[PDB]
């Protein structure tokens with residue numbers, strides 16, 4: 001039986017800027033680094049950056065909607081979004097759903113999000129206003 | 138600051154087979170399904186499957202090393218891996234470069250992994266068998 005997400009691994013084209021982004025800009029904890037990667041944590045999340053020459057710096061119009069959302073409190077959301085904006089980090093989508101969300105790109109174009117709110121909160125909102133064709137289990 | 142993965146969203150090309158894969162084959166909990174997506178959980182993980190006409194079924198030699206690992210116990214690992222194999226689930230990697238792991242593909246070629254062990258355990262293993270150039274902080 002699967003018990004949760006063990007780790008998220010992002011392929012990166014250049015290790016140093018990716019470490020700068022996740023550790024210094026986003027505030028994650030750097031636990032180890034080697035010639036071809038790094039291990040960081042963000043709360044319970046184990047993140048691995050893996051240096052991969054196959055990684056392309058990918059514009060958001062050329063990737064699908066697969067994306068990785070990090071939790072932040074409502075109280076901290078606006079100042080963190082402002083930090084990313086000051087750093088010139090690009091936005092790939094505007095928020096139109098429930099709960100605050102800031103949609104931003106990593107240095108290789110990985111699609112990231114800051115989100116406030118749990119699955120339970122989303123399900124509660126959906127029960128009141130179900131999406132088209134929505135069924136609950 | 139950031140604390141945890143809030144959710145993982147995977148773009149999918151065909152919603153029904155993807156829901157079946159995550160719910161029926163992998164055993165995740167399905168909470169809701171609608172015309173264009175589904176919400177599942179795997180322990181604390183909030184997984185969203187999002188129907189995306191841009192998603193392509195991608196052979197593993199065409200995608201980078203970005204991948205998503207799920208936790209499984211030492212007692213369950215081998216039989217779950219063997220069940221995926223017997224069910225014909227495609228693979229993408231054989232060499233155990235990061236401990237006890239099984240590397241498999243979802244219906245769209247998302248790179249998945251079963252892994253036994255925490256970040257702390259991987260760091261301890263790496264102290265004995267470090268990756269080239271490894272430094273610990």
Ligand SMILES: CCOc1cccc(C(=N)N)c1
Nearest residue numbers: 132133134135170171172173
């Ligand atoms: C018929 C297969 O079972 C479902 C369950 C939930 C939603 C949907 C749907 N197409 N909106 C279909």
Ligand SMILES: CCOc1cccc(C(=N)N)c1
Nearest residue numbers: 157158161162220223224225
């Ligand atoms: C989505 C398919 O779900 C399952 C679940 C369990 C077994 C099998 C199988 N045919 N070996 C398939």
Ligand SMILES: [Mn+2]
Nearest residue numbers: 067069113146
């Ligand atoms: Mn999202």
Ligand SMILES: [Mn+2]
Nearest residue numbers: 009206235250
């Ligand atoms: Mn892995």
